[PDB]
Amino acid sequence: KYNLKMGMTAGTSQNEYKAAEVFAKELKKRSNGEIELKLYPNAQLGKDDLAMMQQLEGGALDFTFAETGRFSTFFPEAEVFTLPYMIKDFNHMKKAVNTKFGKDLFKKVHDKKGMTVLAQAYNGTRQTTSNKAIKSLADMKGMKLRVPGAAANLAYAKYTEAAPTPMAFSEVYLALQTNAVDGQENPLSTIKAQKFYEVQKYLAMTNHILNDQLYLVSNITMEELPENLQKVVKESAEVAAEYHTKLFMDEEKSLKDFFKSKGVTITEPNLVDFKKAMKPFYDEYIKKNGKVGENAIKAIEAVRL
Ligand SMILES: CC(=O)N[C@H]1[C@H]([C@H](O)[C@H](O)CO)O[C@](O)(C(=O)O)C[C@@H]1O
Protein backbone atom coordinates (compact mmCIF):
# COMPACT_ATOMS: atom_id res chain seq x y z
CA LYS A 1 0.00 0.00 0.00
CA TYR A 2 1.22 3.48 -0.92
CA ASN A 3 0.62 6.11 1.75
CA LEU A 4 1.19 9.46 0.05
CA LYS A 5 1.22 12.97 1.51
CA MET A 6 0.06 16.30 0.10
CA GLY A 7 0.94 19.65 1.64
CA MET A 8 -0.65 23.04 0.98
CA THR A 9 -0.80 26.58 2.37
CA ALA A 10 -4.58 26.82 1.96
CA GLY A 11 -6.83 26.01 4.91
CA THR A 12 -9.52 23.35 5.16
CA SER A 13 -12.20 25.97 4.47
CA GLN A 14 -10.80 26.87 1.05
CA ASN A 15 -11.56 25.47 -2.40
CA GLU A 16 -7.99 24.19 -2.77
CA TYR A 17 -8.54 21.78 0.11
CA LYS A 18 -11.97 20.70 -1.17
CA ALA A 19 -10.51 19.84 -4.57
CA ALA A 20 -7.60 18.06 -2.87
CA GLU A 21 -10.14 15.90 -1.05
CA VAL A 22 -11.58 14.90 -4.42
CA PHE A 23 -8.03 14.21 -5.60
CA ALA A 24 -7.41 11.87 -2.66
CA LYS A 25 -10.84 10.32 -3.22
CA GLU A 26 -10.14 9.62 -6.88
CA LEU A 27 -6.73 8.17 -6.01
CA LYS A 28 -8.13 5.65 -3.53
CA LYS A 29 -11.02 4.73 -5.83
CA ARG A 30 -9.05 4.22 -9.04
CA SER A 31 -6.26 2.33 -7.25
CA ASN A 32 -8.56 0.00 -5.29
CA GLY A 33 -7.14 1.22 -1.98
CA GLU A 34 -3.48 0.82 -2.90
CA ILE A 35 -3.02 4.59 -2.85
CA GLU A 36 -4.17 6.58 0.17
CA LEU A 37 -3.47 10.31 0.26
CA LYS A 38 -3.24 12.30 3.48
CA LEU A 39 -3.74 16.07 3.26
CA TYR A 40 -1.61 18.51 5.27
CA PRO A 41 -3.14 22.01 4.94
CA ASN A 42 -2.47 25.41 6.56
CA ALA A 43 1.23 25.09 5.66
CA GLN A 44 1.89 22.75 8.58
CA LEU A 45 4.76 21.13 6.67
CA GLY A 46 6.67 24.25 5.69
CA LYS A 47 6.75 28.04 5.55
CA ASP A 48 5.09 28.31 2.15
CA ASP A 49 4.69 26.81 -1.33
CA LEU A 50 8.41 27.29 -2.00
CA ALA A 51 9.30 25.15 1.02
CA MET A 52 6.89 22.38 0.04
CA MET A 53 8.00 22.40 -3.60
CA GLN A 54 11.55 21.84 -2.36
CA GLN A 55 10.25 18.87 -0.38
CA LEU A 56 8.93 17.32 -3.59
CA GLU A 57 12.39 17.43 -5.16
CA GLY A 58 13.82 15.42 -2.27
CA GLY A 59 10.90 13.02 -2.41
CA ALA A 60 9.94 13.73 1.20
CA LEU A 61 6.61 15.16 0.03
CA ASP A 62 4.53 13.57 -2.73
CA PHE A 63 2.09 16.30 -3.82
CA THR A 64 1.69 20.07 -3.50
CA PHE A 65 0.15 23.17 -5.10
CA ALA A 66 1.87 25.96 -7.05
CA GLU A 67 1.08 28.80 -9.42
CA THR A 68 2.90 28.72 -12.77
CA GLY A 69 4.38 32.16 -12.14
CA ARG A 70 5.76 30.89 -8.83
CA PHE A 71 8.37 28.98 -10.84
CA SER A 72 10.07 32.34 -11.41
CA THR A 73 11.99 31.64 -8.20
CA PHE A 74 13.84 28.89 -10.07
CA PHE A 75 13.35 30.07 -13.65
CA PRO A 76 13.18 33.92 -13.75
CA GLU A 77 11.57 34.00 -17.22
CA ALA A 78 8.50 32.23 -15.83
CA GLU A 79 7.51 35.47 -14.08
CA VAL A 80 5.63 36.49 -17.23
CA PHE A 81 2.83 34.14 -16.12
CA THR A 82 2.22 36.27 -13.02
CA LEU A 83 2.95 39.79 -14.28
CA PRO A 84 0.17 42.19 -13.18
CA TYR A 85 -2.63 42.52 -15.77
CA MET A 86 -0.80 40.18 -18.16
CA ILE A 87 -3.23 37.26 -18.04
CA LYS A 88 -6.76 38.23 -19.09
CA ASP A 89 -8.79 35.16 -18.10
CA PHE A 90 -8.37 31.44 -17.41
CA ASN A 91 -8.78 30.55 -21.08
CA HIS A 92 -5.86 32.88 -21.77
CA MET A 93 -3.95 31.20 -18.94
CA LYS A 94 -4.66 27.73 -20.33
CA LYS A 95 -3.33 28.75 -23.74
CA ALA A 96 -0.43 30.73 -22.25
CA VAL A 97 1.06 27.64 -20.60
CA ASN A 98 0.56 25.68 -23.82
CA THR A 99 2.82 27.97 -25.83
CA LYS A 100 6.30 26.66 -26.68
CA PHE A 101 7.53 28.84 -23.81
CA GLY A 102 5.03 27.33 -21.39
CA LYS A 103 5.71 23.77 -22.49
CA ASP A 104 9.46 24.33 -22.19
CA LEU A 105 8.97 25.65 -18.65
CA PHE A 106 7.12 22.56 -17.41
CA LYS A 107 9.75 20.45 -19.18
CA LYS A 108 12.50 22.29 -17.30
CA VAL A 109 10.61 21.92 -14.01
CA HIS A 110 10.59 18.18 -14.67
CA ASP A 111 14.24 17.90 -15.70
CA LYS A 112 15.84 20.30 -13.22
CA LYS A 113 13.47 20.60 -10.24
CA GLY A 114 12.21 17.02 -9.95
CA MET A 115 8.54 17.96 -10.21
CA THR A 116 5.92 16.89 -12.73
CA VAL A 117 2.93 19.06 -13.60
CA LEU A 118 -0.14 16.81 -13.57
CA ALA A 119 -2.97 19.29 -14.17
CA GLN A 120 -3.82 22.99 -14.20
CA ALA A 121 -6.77 24.57 -12.41
CA TYR A 122 -8.23 28.05 -12.02
CA ASN A 123 -7.52 29.50 -8.57
CA GLY A 124 -9.31 32.83 -8.87
CA THR A 125 -8.40 36.40 -9.79
CA ARG A 126 -6.92 38.57 -7.05
CA GLN A 127 -8.65 41.68 -5.72
CA THR A 128 -7.84 44.25 -3.03
CA THR A 129 -9.42 44.74 0.40
CA SER A 130 -8.86 47.65 2.78
CA ASN A 131 -10.19 49.53 5.80
CA LYS A 132 -10.59 52.59 3.58
CA ALA A 133 -12.33 52.93 0.21
CA ILE A 134 -10.24 52.52 -2.93
CA LYS A 135 -11.96 54.34 -5.80
CA SER A 136 -8.80 55.48 -7.59
CA LEU A 137 -5.07 54.71 -7.77
CA ALA A 138 -4.30 57.65 -5.47
CA ASP A 139 -6.27 56.10 -2.59
CA MET A 140 -3.75 53.27 -2.19
CA LYS A 141 -0.90 55.74 -1.55
CA GLY A 142 0.99 54.85 1.62
CA MET A 143 -1.38 52.12 2.76
CA LYS A 144 0.21 49.08 4.38
CA LEU A 145 -0.83 46.44 1.87
CA ARG A 146 -0.10 42.86 2.88
CA VAL A 147 1.35 40.73 0.09
CA PRO A 148 2.81 37.22 -0.16
CA GLY A 149 6.58 36.87 -0.56
CA ALA A 150 6.41 37.08 -4.35
CA ALA A 151 7.99 39.71 -6.61
CA ALA A 152 4.85 40.22 -8.70
CA ASN A 153 2.68 40.93 -5.65
CA LEU A 154 5.41 43.09 -4.10
CA ALA A 155 5.58 45.10 -7.32
CA TYR A 156 1.82 45.57 -7.40
CA ALA A 157 1.93 47.08 -3.91
CA LYS A 158 4.99 49.19 -4.69
CA TYR A 159 3.78 50.74 -7.96
CA THR A 160 0.37 51.55 -6.46
CA GLU A 161 2.33 53.66 -3.97
CA ALA A 162 1.25 51.29 -1.20
CA ALA A 163 3.71 50.01 1.41
CA PRO A 164 4.51 46.34 0.61
CA THR A 165 4.16 44.37 3.84
CA PRO A 166 5.18 40.73 3.24
CA MET A 167 3.99 38.15 5.78
CA ALA A 168 2.76 34.56 6.04
CA PHE A 169 -0.75 33.66 4.85
CA SER A 170 -1.73 32.27 8.26
CA GLU A 171 -0.92 35.58 9.95
CA VAL A 172 -3.07 37.72 7.64
CA TYR A 173 -6.37 37.74 9.57
CA LEU A 174 -4.85 38.89 12.87
CA ALA A 175 -2.82 41.55 11.08
CA LEU A 176 -5.99 42.91 9.49
CA GLN A 177 -7.93 42.63 12.75
CA THR A 178 -5.36 44.59 14.76
CA ASN A 179 -4.89 47.04 11.88
CA ALA A 180 -1.19 46.14 11.74
CA VAL A 181 -1.71 46.32 7.99
CA ASP A 182 -4.33 48.43 6.19
CA GLY A 183 -5.35 45.72 3.74
CA GLN A 184 -4.56 42.49 1.92
CA GLU A 185 -4.73 41.08 -1.60
CA ASN A 186 -6.36 37.81 -2.70
CA PRO A 187 -9.12 36.25 -4.87
CA LEU A 188 -12.76 36.56 -3.77
CA SER A 189 -12.95 32.86 -2.88
CA THR A 190 -9.98 33.17 -0.52
CA ILE A 191 -11.43 36.34 1.00
CA LYS A 192 -14.64 34.50 1.88
CA ALA A 193 -13.07 31.21 2.99
CA GLN A 194 -10.54 32.91 5.26
CA LYS A 195 -13.24 35.40 6.29
CA PHE A 196 -11.13 38.47 5.56
CA TYR A 197 -14.38 40.36 4.94
CA GLU A 198 -15.07 40.19 8.69
CA VAL A 199 -12.12 42.51 9.25
CA GLN A 200 -12.19 44.48 5.98
CA LYS A 201 -14.87 47.11 5.36
CA TYR A 202 -13.93 47.61 1.71
CA LEU A 203 -13.27 45.60 -1.44
CA ALA A 204 -11.77 46.94 -4.67
CA MET A 205 -12.20 44.99 -7.90
CA THR A 206 -8.61 45.50 -9.01
CA ASN A 207 -8.29 42.28 -11.05
CA HIS A 208 -4.51 42.66 -11.15
CA ILE A 209 -3.25 39.06 -10.94
CA LEU A 210 -4.89 35.82 -12.08
CA ASN A 211 -3.92 32.72 -10.11
CA ASP A 212 -3.82 29.25 -11.62
CA GLN A 213 -3.09 26.12 -9.59
CA LEU A 214 -0.76 23.32 -10.65
CA TYR A 215 -1.11 19.79 -9.29
CA LEU A 216 2.54 18.88 -8.72
CA VAL A 217 3.93 15.42 -8.01
CA SER A 218 7.42 14.41 -6.91
CA ASN A 219 9.49 12.68 -9.60
CA ILE A 220 10.74 10.30 -6.92
CA THR A 221 7.14 9.54 -5.95
CA MET A 222 6.17 8.68 -9.53
CA GLU A 223 9.29 6.50 -9.74
CA GLU A 224 8.17 4.54 -6.66
CA LEU A 225 4.80 3.73 -8.23
CA PRO A 226 3.94 1.02 -10.78
CA GLU A 227 3.34 2.40 -14.26
CA ASN A 228 -0.41 1.74 -14.10
CA LEU A 229 -0.65 3.62 -10.79
CA GLN A 230 1.22 6.55 -12.34
CA LYS A 231 -1.62 6.76 -14.85
CA VAL A 232 -4.10 6.67 -11.97
CA VAL A 233 -2.30 9.63 -10.38
CA LYS A 234 -2.40 11.59 -13.65
CA GLU A 235 -6.11 10.93 -14.25
CA SER A 236 -7.03 11.64 -10.62
CA ALA A 237 -5.38 15.06 -10.78
CA GLU A 238 -7.23 16.01 -13.97
CA VAL A 239 -10.55 15.11 -12.37
CA ALA A 240 -9.76 17.19 -9.29
CA ALA A 241 -8.50 20.10 -11.42
CA GLU A 242 -11.84 20.40 -13.22
CA TYR A 243 -13.68 20.32 -9.89
CA HIS A 244 -11.07 22.78 -8.60
CA THR A 245 -11.72 25.12 -11.53
CA LYS A 246 -15.52 24.93 -11.24
CA LEU A 247 -15.40 25.85 -7.54
CA PHE A 248 -13.70 29.21 -8.10
CA MET A 249 -15.78 29.93 -11.21
CA ASP A 250 -19.14 29.34 -9.52
CA GLU A 251 -18.29 31.47 -6.49
CA GLU A 252 -16.99 34.43 -8.52
CA LYS A 253 -20.46 34.57 -10.10
CA SER A 254 -22.18 35.52 -6.84
CA LEU A 255 -19.53 36.42 -4.25
CA LYS A 256 -19.88 40.17 -4.77
CA ASP A 257 -23.50 39.86 -3.65
CA PHE A 258 -22.43 37.91 -0.56
CA PHE A 259 -19.92 40.57 0.51
CA LYS A 260 -22.36 43.44 -0.04
CA SER A 261 -24.88 41.69 2.21
CA LYS A 262 -22.22 41.51 4.92
CA GLY A 263 -21.86 45.29 4.81
CA VAL A 264 -18.71 45.35 2.69
CA THR A 265 -18.53 48.30 0.30
CA ILE A 266 -17.40 47.16 -3.14
CA THR A 267 -15.65 49.70 -5.35
CA GLU A 268 -14.74 49.31 -9.02
CA PRO A 269 -11.96 51.84 -9.74
CA ASN A 270 -10.78 52.60 -13.27
CA LEU A 271 -7.98 50.15 -14.00
CA VAL A 272 -6.17 51.95 -16.83
CA ASP A 273 -4.25 53.87 -14.16
CA PHE A 274 -3.46 50.58 -12.44
CA LYS A 275 -2.26 48.94 -15.66
CA LYS A 276 -0.12 51.96 -16.56
CA ALA A 277 1.50 51.97 -13.12
CA MET A 278 2.74 48.40 -13.63
CA LYS A 279 4.87 49.34 -16.65
CA PRO A 280 8.15 49.80 -14.72
CA PHE A 281 7.83 46.20 -13.48
CA TYR A 282 7.49 45.07 -17.09
CA ASP A 283 10.67 47.02 -17.84
CA GLU A 284 12.13 45.32 -14.78
CA TYR A 285 11.23 41.87 -16.11
CA ILE A 286 12.57 42.64 -19.58
CA LYS A 287 15.88 44.04 -18.33
CA LYS A 288 16.39 40.95 -16.17
CA ASN A 289 15.44 38.34 -18.77
CA GLY A 290 16.47 40.11 -21.98
CA LYS A 291 15.23 38.83 -25.34
CA VAL A 292 13.90 35.70 -23.63
CA GLY A 293 11.57 37.90 -21.59
CA GLU A 294 10.58 40.03 -24.57
CA ASN A 295 9.67 37.02 -26.70
CA ALA A 296 7.82 35.39 -23.80
CA ILE A 297 5.59 38.44 -23.40
CA LYS A 298 4.84 38.58 -27.13
CA ALA A 299 4.05 34.85 -27.15
CA ILE A 300 1.57 35.11 -24.28
CA GLU A 301 0.08 38.38 -25.54
CA ALA A 302 -0.79 36.61 -28.80
CA VAL A 303 -3.14 34.06 -27.22
CA ARG A 304 -5.23 36.50 -25.19
CA LEU A 305 -8.28 36.54 -27.50
C1 LIG B 1 -0.19 27.47 -4.05
C2 LIG B 1 -0.05 28.54 -3.04
O1 LIG B 1 0.67 28.37 -2.05
N1 LIG B 1 -0.78 29.80 -3.23
C3 LIG B 1 -0.66 30.88 -2.23
C4 LIG B 1 -0.25 32.15 -2.97
C5 LIG B 1 1.04 32.09 -3.51
O2 LIG B 1 1.96 31.79 -2.49
C6 LIG B 1 1.39 33.46 -4.11
O3 LIG B 1 0.37 33.86 -4.90
C7 LIG B 1 2.64 33.36 -4.91
O4 LIG B 1 2.60 32.57 -6.05
O5 LIG B 1 -0.38 33.31 -2.03
C8 LIG B 1 -1.54 33.36 -1.16
O6 LIG B 1 -2.60 33.78 -1.95
C9 LIG B 1 -1.35 34.39 -0.13
O7 LIG B 1 -0.40 34.29 0.69
O8 LIG B 1 -2.12 35.39 -0.07
C10 LIG B 1 -1.92 32.10 -0.60
C11 LIG B 1 -1.90 30.99 -1.50
O9 LIG B 1 -2.20 29.76 -0.79
Residue numbers in the entry: 3 to 307
What's the paper's own text on this?
The first step of this process is the transport of sialic acid to the cytoplasm, which often takes place using a tripartite ATP-independent transport system consisting of a periplasmic binding protein and a membrane transporter. The structure and the thermodynamics of the binding of sugars suggest that all of these proteins have a very well conserved binding pocket and similar binding affinities. While the C1 carboxylate has been identified as the primary binding site, a second conserved hydrogen-bonding network is involved in the initiation and stabilization of the conformational states.
The structure of Pm-SiaP was refined to an R factor of 0.17 and a free R factor of 0.20, and that of Fn-SiaP was refined to an R factor of 0.21 and a free R factor of 0.25. In all of the Neu5Ac-bound structures, a consistent pattern was seen in how Neu5Ac interacts with four of the residues within the pocket. Similar inter­actions between these four residues and Neu5Ac exist in Hi-SiaP and Pm-SiaP, with minor differences in sequence numbering (e.g. Arg127 and Arg147 are involved in the first two interactions in Hi-SiaP), as also seen previously. There was one interaction seen in Hi-SiaP (between Asn10 and O10 of Neu5Ac) that was not evident in Fn-SiaP and Pm-SiaP. The binding affinities of Fn-SiaP and Pm-SiaP to Neu5Ac are 45.5 and 19.7 nM, respectively.
